[PDB]
Amino acid sequence: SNLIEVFVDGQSVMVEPGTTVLQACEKVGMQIPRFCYHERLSVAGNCRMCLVEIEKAPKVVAACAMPVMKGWNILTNSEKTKKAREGVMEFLLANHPLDCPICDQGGECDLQDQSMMFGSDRSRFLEGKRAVEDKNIGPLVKTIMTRCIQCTRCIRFASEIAGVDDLGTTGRGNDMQVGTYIEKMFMSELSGNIIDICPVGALTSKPYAFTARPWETRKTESIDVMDAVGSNIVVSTRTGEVMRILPRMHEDINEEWISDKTRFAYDGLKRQRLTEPMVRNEKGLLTHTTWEDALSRVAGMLQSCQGNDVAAIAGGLVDAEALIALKDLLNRVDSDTLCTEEVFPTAGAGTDLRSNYLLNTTIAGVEEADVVLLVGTNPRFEAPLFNARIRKSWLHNDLKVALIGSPVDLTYRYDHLGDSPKILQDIASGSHPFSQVLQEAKKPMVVLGSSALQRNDGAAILAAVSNIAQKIRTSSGVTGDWKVMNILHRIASQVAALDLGYKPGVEAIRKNPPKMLFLLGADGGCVTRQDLPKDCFIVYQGHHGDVGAPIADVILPGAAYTEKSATYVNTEGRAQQTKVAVMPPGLAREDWKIIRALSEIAGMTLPYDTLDQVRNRLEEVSPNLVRYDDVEGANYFQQASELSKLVNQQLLADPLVPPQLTIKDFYMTDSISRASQTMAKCVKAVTE
Amino acid sequence: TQLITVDEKLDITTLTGVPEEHIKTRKARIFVPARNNMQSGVNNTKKWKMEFDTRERWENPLMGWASTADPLSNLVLTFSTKEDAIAFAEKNGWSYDVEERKVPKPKSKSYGANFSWNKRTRVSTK
Amino acid sequence: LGLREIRIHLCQRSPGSQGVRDFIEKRYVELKKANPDLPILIRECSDVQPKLWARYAFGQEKNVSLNNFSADQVTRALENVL
Amino acid sequence: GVRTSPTGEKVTHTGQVYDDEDYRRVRFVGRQKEVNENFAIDLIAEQPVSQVGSRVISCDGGGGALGHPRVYINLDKETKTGTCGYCGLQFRQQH
Amino acid sequence: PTVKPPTARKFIWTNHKFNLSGTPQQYVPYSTTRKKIQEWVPPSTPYK
Amino acid sequence: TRPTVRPRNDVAHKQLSAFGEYVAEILPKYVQQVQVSCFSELEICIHPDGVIPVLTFLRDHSNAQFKSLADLTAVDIPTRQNRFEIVYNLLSLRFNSRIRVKTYTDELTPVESSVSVYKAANWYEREIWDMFGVFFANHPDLRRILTDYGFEGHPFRKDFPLSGYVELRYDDEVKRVVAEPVELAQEFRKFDLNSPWEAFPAYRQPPE
Amino acid sequence: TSVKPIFSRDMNEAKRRVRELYRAWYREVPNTVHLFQLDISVKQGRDKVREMFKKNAHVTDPRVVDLLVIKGKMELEETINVWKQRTHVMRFFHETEAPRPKDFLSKFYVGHDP
């Protein structure tokens, strides 16, 4: 029943049909050394390293692309296998320049490790050693093309994940220049992920370039921000401080890739940080002081201002722990007007009812999908990792991908349907050769973009797309259980705040201008001092305030996403705990620690001191927020759909368009990425 | 010689001498260390490292260094199975966070499928 | 003062949870229809005690269980709270 | 060849000069801040840009097994001189 | 060393001063490293 | 293969193999492993009850004299329930051979205090008690030697880190030397030197 | 499951040996505080001794109690000799702060100590 017998030097093992010699050899533990094969891409054979003497054959053959007949025996430790490895490793180091000091992959080479453990020692090839002059690929990626071993890995990565098709082989013989022919500065998404693909020191990071060499820096587990998916991030930290980051692998979500913004956000993280507790002064000015007088001022104002006149706009990148501490304090005083930053409707049970406010499908599970439509968004410029997943699906198996709302640069030949909610009404009616594909398909999926949800058509379009989900789920026999419906987001703390049951959108403070408010990561002009009485008392907490910090009354130096062992939530409910890497500069304390110290200084108390006690209260707010790296789906789609008929709202005819439309509006529109200068360098490289 | 023995738990934390501040305050984490993504080799897998969480590292005000009041900051304990890891962590007293092991998912790729006729899996370059 | 928020915690395999599943698949509409000022949150993770909680009156989380209860007794305890 | 910041002391060839609010200036009291008075970037314009009639040429460093290892650099950039990452001295082509 | 005195390098001091410890003119240590994280400088305009 | 690679003798290998098979056959009550490496030095791996009987056999019997006693250490291996490894090392005055009696033990149950037949084992056992905590019942005097008196922690374990928890300094407040929690002046950096790519194919353990 | 304990059968012999060890520490204290020319009242030293005994009263496993008895006997021997100096005996005490309390807000001022 679909097994193949091979002997790995006598040790028998079973092989699935169609696979390679190399996957079975890696199944028994033997890592055959490789240079061109990599599991996120297709199989080239151009590096020739994986030769292995397979018995009863005078010719020694490759192992990355060999079909596996029944009954092999694979001699890895023979004579001429070692002789072929010696020969190939001697061939690679001929036209490779003496740059191992000035390389940037000293600790992380591949020629160095494999030429120690497999190669010869006395070199040959006395004269010669041609050199290829470098190019200018992009100001984010430093490029030396003499060290290129022409292995054709970045080319396959481009043409099979990026879809950009700008890198190519030019020439013959020895002379194969790999790159772009036309002096074009190659700028696209995931171009930061090519420095991890290139196995030799030929494509390195430009802003990192010459600060450390990776044996000094220690590697630490953490969770991503700025995308609702969370590729698992390993920080290489140095000198009580940083050096760089890399992506490590979760199997399901965000496999071996990472965002360009994520990769190049740490510069703005270390650029303009809020450091001290800052209080206004009798001239009208802003200075800094000790924690005593500042927290006493905030505590006295909190005692002498009560009612519903106390607000908290919690946007940006904050914790679940900080939100639970804030909710404990604010319910402990009298009442609340917590709000988030972005707007999400609550008519058809959007706050509660676990289905209708997260991505209910599995991010790995969209590869098993059949037909997906896509109501207005731009996933190349809104969390590009999910777009890489969609292109992985569309490349390997078969999809039918539709886009409704804006002609944008999705590089994988989408079918566009138009820009009108009345077209969604037609699909609901619905006369198409494609709505037939929806209601007669096997596994249907509708992806909601949240950029079309921050308009004034949230409840009606949400109810209409939920009625589409009800329609196709009750039809087509699908499956059970499995779902058409999922939505996306952009900001992780918004999803965590919806999970903690908050009030999304600042409309409660548009209704109620307060006496007091806490701006926890207020990015821009969510509210003003004009829309509120002139004795505002904002307490703006965070790091590198650019807007809001000139709107300052009481500034608290809130921590960052690398500076605390907090818990974040992705878009599909999987709670993932962050870890401490670098302590915050300045004083710059911890967020929930600031909240409990504020409750201590005020004439009250809160029943927690430790992060274990904070985890206990987070458990008693939600039980799935302690089961870290654990996922479990949602249900009650028909209940959410029949509750989506309470306020039957009209639908506009105006063309819906996302704000995230191009390169610069992907780069700039976050706080920490807005801080940095290397993002400004690549933005002016786009415009110039 | 066939003496008292009773089937119970272990309490070595009253013997190993590290103070109770570091016992109850600091938290352990058990994980297989991920593959350092720039290389692609998983000999750095197959081990279960036990680490402690990071803490404050200020500036040394004369040379520009990262001093710390953390003796336990540079511990690592490479193990072979999750069971003995959890058993040792519960034996020596402090708390621990278990992250689960994630293998690379087996795939289905072929060069002939990269040379398709009417399937969209096409190399488009070579 | 009066009730502010109601918390429901359920799972996929428990008979009391099965009864509260039949409650939440039959009789959700009358509560929110009669009371739109109560964001009654519903939670599903994998396996948890089927708990019915109520947060109101200056920070009071009042606590009952819906372990191995019939759905009419569940609605009885729900009206007992509200 | 040094700047003088408004703090009033010698600056270095790294942008590390002090602020007025510092105590490390006053721990420099009584003992001079010794610095190399022969900087690095200024000794690049002093070196003449050599012009070699070949195309893909060599750099060793003035001595067999005394210096930095061999590196062969290209001159395909028509207006930009080839720059050894080790040496720091330039090259041109003359057809 | 007057048989072959010199060397052909243009950086050698003309002094080789003796051990200058216990003086007003001797070494002090300091970290040759720039700003850590560039602390936030607020906008100095006044409101209200 | 012959120049600059050390040749060996299979004759000594066969001699130690036959001798270890003989000892394994004639003391069956406690023998678990008799392993011989490539360069012919014997290892005998023993349950922690036959310490006194096996050492009384191995001191005598005129086929294995082995009067000379050497090292004792209990190599701290986690991922086990029996953590510590008591390693007796024995040298024969009459036969010129080295046997390593590795008996296994856990954290809290004593092995049976080999000082009764080995007068060299006294400060060895006191050293192992001081650095580890392997208790030795039926022993004359167990004290702390090679550590400070007021210091505790059993520092040669793996749970004890590199730097100590305490650090002395003199102070003129109470006019004496006091201990404080450790305030390092530098990090003791940690180089991730465990490179991949399987430098020895013969010692591959079977993965799961 | 075969486990060979040190001395114990139940906790009765544990109680017996630990009360005899405390009697030995009681008649150990005044001779040492007179011999080392120390600077601490006898009441304070005896109260810190019984406080150190009352720290580890939460252990019911008898092997652990046996090993505690053996450690206390070792240090009672090494202090009833003149082998340990003034430094180690003062090191048992804490007269040099070490001021750190367990308040939340106190650890919130001097931060990053949760």
Ligand code: SF4
């Ligand atoms: S640039 Fe790097 S990845 Fe691309 S072919 Fe050259 S060596 Fe391979």
Ligand code: SF4
């Ligand atoms: S990539 Fe080339 S230059 Fe860089 S370390 Fe490896 S062998 Fe040396």
Ligand code: FES
């Ligand atoms: S790995 Fe098979 S040839 Fe490159």
Ligand SMILES: [Zn+2]
């Ligand atoms: Zn050079």
